[PDB]
Backbone as a ProteinNet text record, in pm:
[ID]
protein_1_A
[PRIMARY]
XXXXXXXXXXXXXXXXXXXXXXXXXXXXXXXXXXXXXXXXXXXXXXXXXXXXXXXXXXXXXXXXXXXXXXXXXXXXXXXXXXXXXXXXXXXXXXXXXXXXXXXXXXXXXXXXXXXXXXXXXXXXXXXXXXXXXXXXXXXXXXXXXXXXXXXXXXXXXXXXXXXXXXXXXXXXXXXXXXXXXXXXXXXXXXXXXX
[TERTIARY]
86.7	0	87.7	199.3	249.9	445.1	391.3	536.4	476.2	338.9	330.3	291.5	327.4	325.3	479	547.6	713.8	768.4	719.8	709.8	721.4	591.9	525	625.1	614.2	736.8	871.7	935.9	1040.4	1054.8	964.5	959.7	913	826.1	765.4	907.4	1045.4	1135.9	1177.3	1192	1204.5	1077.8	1017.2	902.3	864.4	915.4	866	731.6	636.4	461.6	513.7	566.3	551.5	440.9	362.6	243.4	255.7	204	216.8	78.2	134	18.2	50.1	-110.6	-59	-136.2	-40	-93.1	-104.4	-146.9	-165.5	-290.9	-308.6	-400.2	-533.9	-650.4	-764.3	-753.9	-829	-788.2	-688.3	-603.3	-469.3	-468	-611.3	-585.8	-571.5	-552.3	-471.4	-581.4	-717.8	-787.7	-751.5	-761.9	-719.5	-592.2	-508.3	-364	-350.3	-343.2	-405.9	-459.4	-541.3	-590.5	-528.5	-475.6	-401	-237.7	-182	-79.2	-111	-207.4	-291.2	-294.7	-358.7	-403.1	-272.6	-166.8	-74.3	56.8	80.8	98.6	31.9	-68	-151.7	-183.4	-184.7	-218.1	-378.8	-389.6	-522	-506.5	-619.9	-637	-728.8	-744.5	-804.7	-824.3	-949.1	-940.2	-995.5	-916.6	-912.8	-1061.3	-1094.3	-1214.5	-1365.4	-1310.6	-1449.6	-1455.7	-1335.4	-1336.2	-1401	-1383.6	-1441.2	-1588.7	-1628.9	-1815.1	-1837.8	-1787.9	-1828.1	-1816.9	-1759.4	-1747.9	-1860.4	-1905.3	-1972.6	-2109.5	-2192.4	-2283.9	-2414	-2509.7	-2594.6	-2589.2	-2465.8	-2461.1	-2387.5	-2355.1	-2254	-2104.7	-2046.3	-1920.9	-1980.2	-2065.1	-2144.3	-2160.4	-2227.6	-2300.3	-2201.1	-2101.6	-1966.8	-1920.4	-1922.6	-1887.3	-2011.8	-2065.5	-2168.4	-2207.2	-2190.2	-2227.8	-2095.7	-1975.8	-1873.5	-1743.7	-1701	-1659.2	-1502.7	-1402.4	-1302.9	-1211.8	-1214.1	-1160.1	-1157.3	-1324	-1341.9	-1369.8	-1354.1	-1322.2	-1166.2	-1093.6	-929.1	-903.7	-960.8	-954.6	-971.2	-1076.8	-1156.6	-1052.5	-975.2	-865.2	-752.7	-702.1	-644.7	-623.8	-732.5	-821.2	-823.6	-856.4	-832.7	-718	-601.7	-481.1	-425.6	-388.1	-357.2	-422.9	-477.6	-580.9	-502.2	-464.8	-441.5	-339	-185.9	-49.2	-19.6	-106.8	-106.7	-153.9	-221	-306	-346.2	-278.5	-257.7	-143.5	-85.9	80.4	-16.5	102.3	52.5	-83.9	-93	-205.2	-153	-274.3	-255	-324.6	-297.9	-392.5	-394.4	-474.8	-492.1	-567.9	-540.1	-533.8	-608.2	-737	-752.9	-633	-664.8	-572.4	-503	-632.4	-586.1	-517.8	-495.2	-442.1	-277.4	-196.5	-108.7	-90.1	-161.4	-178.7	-97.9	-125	-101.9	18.6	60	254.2	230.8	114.1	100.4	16.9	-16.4	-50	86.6	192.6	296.4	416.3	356.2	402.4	396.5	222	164.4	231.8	211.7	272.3	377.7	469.1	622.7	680.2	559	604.5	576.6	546.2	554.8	662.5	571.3	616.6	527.9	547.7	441.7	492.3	373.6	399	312.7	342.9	278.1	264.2	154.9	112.4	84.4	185.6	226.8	191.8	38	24.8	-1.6	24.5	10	-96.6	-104.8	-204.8	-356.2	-269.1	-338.4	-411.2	-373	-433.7	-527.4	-471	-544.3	-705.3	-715.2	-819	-904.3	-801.7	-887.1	-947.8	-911.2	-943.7	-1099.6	-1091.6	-1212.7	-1310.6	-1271.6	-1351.5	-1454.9	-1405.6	-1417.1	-1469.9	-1469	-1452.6	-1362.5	-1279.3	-1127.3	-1075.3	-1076.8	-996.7	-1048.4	-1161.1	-1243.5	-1189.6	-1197.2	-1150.7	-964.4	-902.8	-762.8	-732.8	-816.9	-823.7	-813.3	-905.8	-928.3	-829	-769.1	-634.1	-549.3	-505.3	-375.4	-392.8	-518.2	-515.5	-454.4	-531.3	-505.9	-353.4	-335.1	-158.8	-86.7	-96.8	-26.6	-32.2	-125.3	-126.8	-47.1	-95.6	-19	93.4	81	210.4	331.6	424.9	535.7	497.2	427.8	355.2	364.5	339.5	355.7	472.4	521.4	711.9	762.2	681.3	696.1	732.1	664.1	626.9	757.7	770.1	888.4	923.5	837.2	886.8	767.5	817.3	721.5	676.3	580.6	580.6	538.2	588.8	562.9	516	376.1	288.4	329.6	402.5	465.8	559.9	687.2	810.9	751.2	651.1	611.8	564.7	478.3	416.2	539.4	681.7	748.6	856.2	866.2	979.2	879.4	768.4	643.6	651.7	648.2	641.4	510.8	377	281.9	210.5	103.2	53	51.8	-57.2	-109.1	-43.6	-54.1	-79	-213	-292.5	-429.8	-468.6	-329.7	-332.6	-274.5	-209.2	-219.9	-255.5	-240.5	-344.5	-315.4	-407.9	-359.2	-285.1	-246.8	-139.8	1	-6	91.1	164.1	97.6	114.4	164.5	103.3	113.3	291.4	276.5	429.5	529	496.5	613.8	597.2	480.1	482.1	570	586.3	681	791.2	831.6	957.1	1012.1	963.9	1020.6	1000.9	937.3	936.6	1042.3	1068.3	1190.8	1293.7	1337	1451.1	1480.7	1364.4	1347.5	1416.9	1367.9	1374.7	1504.6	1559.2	1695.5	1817.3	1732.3	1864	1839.2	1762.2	1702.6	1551.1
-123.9	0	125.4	125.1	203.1	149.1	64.4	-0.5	27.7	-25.2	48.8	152.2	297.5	416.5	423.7	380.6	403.6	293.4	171	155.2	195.2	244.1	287	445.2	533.3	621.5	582.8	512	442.3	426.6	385.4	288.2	440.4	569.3	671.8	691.3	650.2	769.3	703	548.4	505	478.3	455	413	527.7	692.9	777.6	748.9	780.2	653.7	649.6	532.4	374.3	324.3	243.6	198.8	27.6	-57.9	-141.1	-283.4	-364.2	-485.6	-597.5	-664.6	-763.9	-868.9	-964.6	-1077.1	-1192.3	-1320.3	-1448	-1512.4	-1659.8	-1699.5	-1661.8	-1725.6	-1708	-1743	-1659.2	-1665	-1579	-1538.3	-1514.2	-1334.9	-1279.4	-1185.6	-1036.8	-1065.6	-927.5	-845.5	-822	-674.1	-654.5	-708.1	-651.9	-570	-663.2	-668.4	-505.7	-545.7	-391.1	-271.6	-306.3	-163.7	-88.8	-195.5	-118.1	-96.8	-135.7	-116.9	38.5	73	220.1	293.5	295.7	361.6	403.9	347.5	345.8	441.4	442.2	529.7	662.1	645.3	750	761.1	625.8	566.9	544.5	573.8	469	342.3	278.9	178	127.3	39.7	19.8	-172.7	-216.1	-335.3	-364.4	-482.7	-479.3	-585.6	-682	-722	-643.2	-533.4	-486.4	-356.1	-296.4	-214.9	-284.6	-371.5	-463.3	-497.9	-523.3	-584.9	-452.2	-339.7	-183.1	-157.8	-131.2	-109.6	-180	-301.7	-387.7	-332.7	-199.3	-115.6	-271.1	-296.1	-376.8	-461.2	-545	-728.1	-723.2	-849.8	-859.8	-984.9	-1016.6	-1109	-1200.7	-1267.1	-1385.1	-1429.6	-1326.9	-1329.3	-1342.9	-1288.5	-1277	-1399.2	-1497.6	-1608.4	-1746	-1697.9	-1827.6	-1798.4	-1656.7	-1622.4	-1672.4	-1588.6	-1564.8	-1651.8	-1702.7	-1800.4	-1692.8	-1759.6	-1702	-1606.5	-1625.3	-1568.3	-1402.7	-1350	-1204.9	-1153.8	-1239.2	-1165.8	-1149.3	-1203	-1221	-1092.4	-1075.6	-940.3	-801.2	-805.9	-664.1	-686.3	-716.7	-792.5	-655	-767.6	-698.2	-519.6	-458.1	-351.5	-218.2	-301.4	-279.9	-226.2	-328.3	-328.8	-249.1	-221.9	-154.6	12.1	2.2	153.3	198.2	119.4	141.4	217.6	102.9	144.1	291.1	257.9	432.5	514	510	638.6	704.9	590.7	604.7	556	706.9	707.6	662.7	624.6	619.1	488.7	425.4	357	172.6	108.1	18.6	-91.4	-187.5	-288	-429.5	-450.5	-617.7	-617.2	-786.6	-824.4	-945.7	-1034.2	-1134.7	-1244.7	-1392.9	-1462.8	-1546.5	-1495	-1492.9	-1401.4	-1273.9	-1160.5	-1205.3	-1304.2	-1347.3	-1448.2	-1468.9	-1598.1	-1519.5	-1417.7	-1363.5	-1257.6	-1284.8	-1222.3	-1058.3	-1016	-840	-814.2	-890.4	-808.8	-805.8	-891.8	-874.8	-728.1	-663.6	-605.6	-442.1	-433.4	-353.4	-317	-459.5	-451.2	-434.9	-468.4	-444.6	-343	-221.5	-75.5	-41.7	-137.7	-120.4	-180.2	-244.8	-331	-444	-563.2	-653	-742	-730.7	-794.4	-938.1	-1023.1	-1212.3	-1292.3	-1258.2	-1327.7	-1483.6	-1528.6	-1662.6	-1733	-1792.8	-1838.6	-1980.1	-2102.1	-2219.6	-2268.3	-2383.9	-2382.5	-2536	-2523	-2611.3	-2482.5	-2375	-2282	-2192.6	-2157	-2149.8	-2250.5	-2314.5	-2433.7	-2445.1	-2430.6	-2400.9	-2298.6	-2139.7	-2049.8	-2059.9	-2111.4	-2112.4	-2196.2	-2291	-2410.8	-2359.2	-2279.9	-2211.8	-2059.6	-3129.2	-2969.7	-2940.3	-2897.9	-2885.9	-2950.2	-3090.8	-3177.1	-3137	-3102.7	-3070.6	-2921.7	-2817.2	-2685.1	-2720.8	-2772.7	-2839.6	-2864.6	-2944.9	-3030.9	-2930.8	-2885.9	-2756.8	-2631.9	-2606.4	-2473.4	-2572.3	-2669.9	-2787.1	-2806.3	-2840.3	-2779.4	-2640.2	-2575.6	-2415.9	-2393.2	-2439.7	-2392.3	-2483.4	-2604	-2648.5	-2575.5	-2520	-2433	-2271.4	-2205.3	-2046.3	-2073.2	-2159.2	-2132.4	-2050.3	-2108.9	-2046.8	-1910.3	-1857	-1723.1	-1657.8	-1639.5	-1575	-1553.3	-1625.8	-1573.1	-1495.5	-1471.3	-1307.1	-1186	-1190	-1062.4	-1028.1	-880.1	-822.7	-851.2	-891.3	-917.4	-1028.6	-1140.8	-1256.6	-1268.4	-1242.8	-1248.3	-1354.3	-1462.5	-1575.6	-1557.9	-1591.1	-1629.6	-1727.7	-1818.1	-1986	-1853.5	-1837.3	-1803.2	-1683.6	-1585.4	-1528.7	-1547.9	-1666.4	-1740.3	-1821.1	-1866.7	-1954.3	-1802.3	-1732.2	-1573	-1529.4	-1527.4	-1464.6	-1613.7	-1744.7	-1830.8	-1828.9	-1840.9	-1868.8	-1971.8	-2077.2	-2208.9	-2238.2	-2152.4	-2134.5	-2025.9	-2033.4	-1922.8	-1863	-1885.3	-1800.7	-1743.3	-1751.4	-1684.6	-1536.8	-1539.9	-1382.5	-1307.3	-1173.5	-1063.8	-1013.4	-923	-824.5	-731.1	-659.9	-580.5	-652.5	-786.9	-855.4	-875.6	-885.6	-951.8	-819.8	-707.4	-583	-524.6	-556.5	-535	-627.8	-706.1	-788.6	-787.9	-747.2	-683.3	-567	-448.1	-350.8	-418	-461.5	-509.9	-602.1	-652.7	-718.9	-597.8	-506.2	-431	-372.9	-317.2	-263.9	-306.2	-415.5	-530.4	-513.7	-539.6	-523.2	-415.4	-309.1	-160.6	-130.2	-121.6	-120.8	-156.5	-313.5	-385.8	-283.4	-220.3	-166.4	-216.8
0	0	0	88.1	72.2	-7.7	-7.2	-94.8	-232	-245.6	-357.3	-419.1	-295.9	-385.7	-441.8	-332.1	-340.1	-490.7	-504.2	-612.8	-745.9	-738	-858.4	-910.9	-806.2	-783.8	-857	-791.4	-877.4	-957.6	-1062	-1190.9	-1287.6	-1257.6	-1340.9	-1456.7	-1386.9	-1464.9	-1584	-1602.2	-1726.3	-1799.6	-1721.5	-1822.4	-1940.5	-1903	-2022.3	-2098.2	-1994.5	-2031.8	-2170.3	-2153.8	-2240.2	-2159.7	-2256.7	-2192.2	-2168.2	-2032.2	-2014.3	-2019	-2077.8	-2103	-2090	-1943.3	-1911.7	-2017	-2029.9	-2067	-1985.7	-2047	-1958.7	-1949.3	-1943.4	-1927.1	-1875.9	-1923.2	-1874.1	-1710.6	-1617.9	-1475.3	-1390.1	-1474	-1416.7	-1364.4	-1338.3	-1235	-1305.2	-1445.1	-1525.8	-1508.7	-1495.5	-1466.1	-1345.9	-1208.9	-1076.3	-1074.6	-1129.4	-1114.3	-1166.4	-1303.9	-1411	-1324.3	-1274.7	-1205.9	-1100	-1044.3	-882.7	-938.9	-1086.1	-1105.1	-1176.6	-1286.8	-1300.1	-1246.4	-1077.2	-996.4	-927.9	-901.4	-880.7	-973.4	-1063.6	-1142.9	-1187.7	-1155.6	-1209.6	-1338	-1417.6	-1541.5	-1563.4	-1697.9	-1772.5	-1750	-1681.1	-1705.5	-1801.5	-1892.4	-2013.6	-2002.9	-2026.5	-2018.7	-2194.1	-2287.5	-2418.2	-2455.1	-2367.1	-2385.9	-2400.3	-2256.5	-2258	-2353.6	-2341.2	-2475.8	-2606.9	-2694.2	-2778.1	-2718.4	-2672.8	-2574.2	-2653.6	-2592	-2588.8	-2733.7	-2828.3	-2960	-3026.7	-3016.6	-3094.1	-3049.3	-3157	-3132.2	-3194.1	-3101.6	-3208.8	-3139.3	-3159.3	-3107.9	-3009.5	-2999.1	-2879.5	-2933.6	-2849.3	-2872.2	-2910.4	-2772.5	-2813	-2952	-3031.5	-3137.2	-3270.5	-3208.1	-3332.5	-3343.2	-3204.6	-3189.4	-3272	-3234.7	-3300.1	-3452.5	-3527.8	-3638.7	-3711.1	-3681.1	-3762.3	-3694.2	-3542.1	-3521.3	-3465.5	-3412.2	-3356.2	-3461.3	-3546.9	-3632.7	-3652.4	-3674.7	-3655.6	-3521.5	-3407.5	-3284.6	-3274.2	-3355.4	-3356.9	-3427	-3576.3	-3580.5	-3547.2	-3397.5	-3334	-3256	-3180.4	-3066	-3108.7	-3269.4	-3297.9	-3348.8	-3372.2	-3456.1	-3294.6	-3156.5	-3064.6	-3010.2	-3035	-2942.5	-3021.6	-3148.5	-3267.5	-3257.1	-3217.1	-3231	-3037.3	-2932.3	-2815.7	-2806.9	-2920.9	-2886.6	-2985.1	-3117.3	-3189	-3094	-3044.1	-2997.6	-2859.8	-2763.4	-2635.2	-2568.4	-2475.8	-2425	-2280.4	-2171.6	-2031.9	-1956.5	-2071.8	-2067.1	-1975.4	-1868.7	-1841.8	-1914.7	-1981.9	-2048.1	-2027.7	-1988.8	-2000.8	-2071.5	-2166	-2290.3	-2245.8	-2312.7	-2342.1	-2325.9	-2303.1	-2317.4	-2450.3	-2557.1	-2642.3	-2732.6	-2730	-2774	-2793.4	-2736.8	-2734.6	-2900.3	-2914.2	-3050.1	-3199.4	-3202.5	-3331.6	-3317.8	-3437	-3434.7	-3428.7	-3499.7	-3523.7	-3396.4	-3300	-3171.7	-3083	-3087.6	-3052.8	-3101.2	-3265	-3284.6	-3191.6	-3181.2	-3110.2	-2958.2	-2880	-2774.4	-2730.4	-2794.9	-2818.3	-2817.1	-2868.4	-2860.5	-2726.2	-2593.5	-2481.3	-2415.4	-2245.6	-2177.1	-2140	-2164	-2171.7	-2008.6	-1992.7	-1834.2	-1804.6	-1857.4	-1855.4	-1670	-1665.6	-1517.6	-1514.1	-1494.5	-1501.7	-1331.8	-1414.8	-1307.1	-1328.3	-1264.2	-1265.3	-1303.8	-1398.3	-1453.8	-1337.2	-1220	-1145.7	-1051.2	-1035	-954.6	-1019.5	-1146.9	-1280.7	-1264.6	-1257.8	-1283.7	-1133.9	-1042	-912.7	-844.6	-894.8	-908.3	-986.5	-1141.5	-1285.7	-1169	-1097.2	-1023.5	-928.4	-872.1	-699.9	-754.7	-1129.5	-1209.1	-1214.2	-1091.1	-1080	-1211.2	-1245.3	-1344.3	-1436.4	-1453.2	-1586.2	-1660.1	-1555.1	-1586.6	-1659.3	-1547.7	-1603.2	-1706.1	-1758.7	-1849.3	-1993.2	-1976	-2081.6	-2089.4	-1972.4	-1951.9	-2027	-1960.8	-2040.8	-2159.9	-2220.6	-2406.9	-2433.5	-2366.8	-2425.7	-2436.7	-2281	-2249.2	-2369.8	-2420.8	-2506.1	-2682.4	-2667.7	-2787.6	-2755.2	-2643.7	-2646.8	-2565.3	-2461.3	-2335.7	-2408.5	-2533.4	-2581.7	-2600.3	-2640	-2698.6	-2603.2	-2463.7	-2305	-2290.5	-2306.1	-2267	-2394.2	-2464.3	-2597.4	-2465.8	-2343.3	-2303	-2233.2	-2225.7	-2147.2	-2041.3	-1936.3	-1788.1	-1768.2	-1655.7	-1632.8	-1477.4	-1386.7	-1297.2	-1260.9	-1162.7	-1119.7	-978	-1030.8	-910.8	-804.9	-838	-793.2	-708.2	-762.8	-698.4	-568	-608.8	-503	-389.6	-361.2	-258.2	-169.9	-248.9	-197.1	-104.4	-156.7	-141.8	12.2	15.2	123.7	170.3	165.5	301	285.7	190	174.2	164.1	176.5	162.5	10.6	-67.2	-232.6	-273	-422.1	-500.2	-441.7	-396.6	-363.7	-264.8	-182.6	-62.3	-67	-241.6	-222.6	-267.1	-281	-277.2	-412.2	-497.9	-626.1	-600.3	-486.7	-426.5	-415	-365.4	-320.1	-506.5	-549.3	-730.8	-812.5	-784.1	-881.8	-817.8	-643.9	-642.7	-696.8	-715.4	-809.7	-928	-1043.5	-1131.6	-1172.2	-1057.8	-1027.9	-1077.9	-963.1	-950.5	-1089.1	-1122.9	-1244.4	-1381.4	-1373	-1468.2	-1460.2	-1335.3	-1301.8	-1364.7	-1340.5	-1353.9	-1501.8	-1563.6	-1730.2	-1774.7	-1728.8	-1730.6	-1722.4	-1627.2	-1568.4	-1704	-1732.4	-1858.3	-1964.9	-1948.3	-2125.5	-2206.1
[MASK]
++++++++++++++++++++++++++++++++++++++++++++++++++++++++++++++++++++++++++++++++++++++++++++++++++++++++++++++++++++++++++++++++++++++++++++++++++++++++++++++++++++++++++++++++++++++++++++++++++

C-alpha cells in the first residue's frame, strides 16, 4: 500500500509513459492486477475485452462467436490493441488470453512493456472451479497451444516463486497488491537492462 506508492514512484522515470500490457491466461488476475498497477501510477487503465463488448454497437461477442466463429473476434482484438499502442501514451492494459496468438498483436505490444502473469495452470483451474480436473483439463489444451507465446512478453511475474519468497501455503493466498508489487519489480529489472 504504501510499498506500492514508493514503487510505482520508482519505476515513473524510465518508463517515459511507455504503456504497459498484461498478458496471460484465462484466470490469471490481469484486470485486478491492471488496475491497482494504473491507480498506482496514475495511469489509464483500459481493459481490451471490454473495450471490444463496448465497440460492438448492435450485437454482442457472443453473437460474433456463433455467427462468424473465432476468427473475426481475432480481428476486433487486434483492430483494438492496434488503435491502443497508436493512440494512447501512459495507458494500463490487459489483454484477453488470447491476444497473445497472433505475431502483429505482438508487434503492437512491443512498442511497450508486456507484463505475462504466469500463473500455474493447477491454480489457474482451481481459481475457474471455486470440475477442478475438468476446468484443467481444458487450460492444459489451451496452455499447449499459447504457453510459448507468453514468454513473448517483457517481464514474467511468477505467481509460484512469489508465494514460496512470502512463506505462503497457495498461489491463492495472495493478494492483487501482493502480485502488482512484483509486477513492479520485475518491470523494473526489465527496465533497468534496457
Amino acid at each position: 500500500q504504501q510499498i506500492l506508492k514508493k514503487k510505482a514512484e520508482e519505476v515513473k522515470p524510465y518508463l517515459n509513459g511507455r504503456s504497459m500490457y498484461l498478458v496471460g491466461m484465462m484466470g490469471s488476475g490481469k484486470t485486478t492486477v491492471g488496475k491497482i498497477m494504473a491507480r498506482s501510477l496514475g495511469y489509464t487503465f483500459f481493459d481490451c475485452d471490454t473495450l471490444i463488448e463496448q465497440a460492438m454497437k448492435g450485437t454482442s461477442v457472443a453473437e460474433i462467436f456463433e455467427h462468424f466463429g473465432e476468427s473475426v473476434f481475432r480481428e476486433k482484438e487486434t483492430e483494438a490493441l492496434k488503435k491502443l499502442s497508436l493512440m494512447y501514451h501512459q495507458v494500463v492494459v490487459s489483454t484477453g488470453g488470447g491476444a497473445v496468438i497472433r505475431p502483429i498483436n505482438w508487434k503492437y505490444m512491443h512498442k511497450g512493456i508486456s507484463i505475462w502473469l504466469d500463473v500455474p495452470l493447477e491454480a489457474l483451474a482451481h481459481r475457474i472451479a471455486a470440475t477442478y480436473t475438468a476446468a484443467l483439463n481444458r487450460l492444459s489444451t489451451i496452455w499447449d497451444a499459447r504457453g510459448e507465446a507468453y514468454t513473448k512478453a517483457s517481464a514474467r511475474v511468477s505467481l509460484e516463486n512469489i508465494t514460496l519468497k512470502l512463506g505462503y501455503r497457495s498461489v491463492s493466498d495472495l493478494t492483487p497488491a501482493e502480485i502488482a508489487i512484483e509486477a513492479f519489480e520485475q518491470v523494473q529489472s526489465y527496465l533497468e537492462k534496457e
